[PDB]
Design a protein around this nucleic acid. Structure first.
Ligand SMILES: Nc1nc2c(ncn2[C@H]2C[C@H](O)[C@@H](CO[P@](=O)([SeH])OP(=O)(O)OP(=O)(O)O)O2)c(=O)[nH]1
Ligand SMILES: Nc1nc2c(ncn2[C@H]2C[C@H](O)[C@@H](CO[P@](=O)([SeH])OP(=O)(O)OP(=O)(O)O)O2)c(=O)[nH]1
Ligand SMILES: [Mn+2]
Ligand SMILES: [Mn+2]
Lengths: 176, 178
DNA sequence: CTGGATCCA
DNA sequence: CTGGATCCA
DNA sequence: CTGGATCCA
DNA sequence: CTGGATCCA
């Protein structure tokens, strides 16, 4: 995995938006643009990137075993380092260089929690999570939990989630 | 794979050799591990004819020692290299009588002993049936204890035999478990 | 069935 | 802070 | 490698 | 309707 600039990251994401699909029992299902979310240091607009992180929103639980393991990227040369249902790491060829692409999956119901988790940075996530831990809550990429039971927040966006958790909303680049 | 297959008796002779030769460094103090706190487990305890490795469970008196026992293990006089080594699992490739074998070391705390022995004895298929049955009654059995809702259920038991009976199963000697 | 060592995310 | 993939145990 | 019950095309 | 997939303790 080589080092990328922000500008290169954005250009790679633009190329992938239209070209991600997966094979579901011998049928090629296209992944929709609205279900593809740039996360990690790219969403945070860091000028240096070690990789490109994309979150894929999966409409149904039964598709989890198919999406990342049978991933297709039309016309692009890549090799797969590790791949399960929730994280898949590809090495993509881009013009005499090799870049690390990380793909992650969230179910529709996990969406804002996954976006929050994968946006980071880690330092920010630790503060937030410790603050909720003190109130006996547990936050991860799948939900908010109290006593190992899911807390039913009824929210769509990452912004709604953050307000509902009782924290000051900050744009991805201003989180630290 | 790491090591060659051994006969049962080869495995036992290796265990007999190692019983009086395991030690660890506790801040430069070299402490011998007691034979009483070493239990042969895995296919050796089940008395299978051929073994793919040797599994030993080391019983550790106190929690503070877990960061020292396996990470600073010593087998004086024996030639070996390390595959992986943490506090709960250390795997070694040992030289015994001019062939290379895999030696698995595991640690259990004193309170965990009967659960650990049960875990590491196997066989795997047997353990899965036992655990599935307890899972259906909302328990979780592992090498550290029996749990109900991520909370330790303190059984008044000491040995593996007592544990297997208290869990509501028919006790079978290691070699009869399938 | 359940979890460890490693190296990430 | 909290969890995933790999290859085991 | 739960394994019988229950769901759903 | 029933059989393969998924549920659940
Ligand atoms: N809770 C938690 N989340 C973590 C962690 N590491 C990465 N993540 C999540 C948040 C990160 O923004 C995202 C991608 O991680 P990674 O690629 Se290692 O770092 P990222 O912030 O993108 O910067 P870069 O890729 O190093 O440029 O995954 C972590 O340790 N704990
Ligand atoms: N719960 C559970 N326990 C497992 C598992 N694999 C190994 N173990 C435990 C039980 C085994 O008897 C023990 C040693 O494993 P391993 O060395 Se892979 O098999 P073992 O029975 O010694 O046969 P051999 O080493 O192949 O001769 O560790 C497992 O999948 N689940
Ligand atoms: Mn990244
Ligand atoms: Mn073994």
């Amino acid at each position: 995995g080589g080092m990328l600039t922000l500008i290169q990251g954005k250009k790679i994401v633009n190329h992938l938006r239209s070209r991600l699909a997966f094979e579901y029992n011998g049928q090629l299902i296209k992944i929709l643009s609205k279900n593809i979310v740039a996360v990690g240091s790219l969403r945070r607009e860091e000028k240096m990137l070690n990789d490109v992180d994309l979150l894929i929103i999966v409409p149904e639980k039964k598709l989890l075993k198919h999406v990342l393991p049978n991933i297709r990227i039309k016309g692009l040369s890549f090799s797969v380092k590790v791949c399960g249902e929730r994280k898949c790491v590809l090495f993509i060829e881009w013009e005499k260089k090799t870049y690390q692409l990380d793909l992650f999956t969230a179910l529709a119901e996990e969406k804002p929690y996954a976006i929050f988790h994968f946006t980071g940075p880690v330092s920010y996530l630790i503060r937030i999570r410790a603050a909720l831990k003190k109130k006996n809550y547990k936050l991860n990429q799948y939900g908010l939990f109290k006593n190992q039971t899911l807390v039913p927040l009824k929210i769509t966006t990452e912004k709604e989630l953050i307000k509902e958790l009782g924290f000051t909303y900050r744009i991805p680049k201003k989180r630290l």
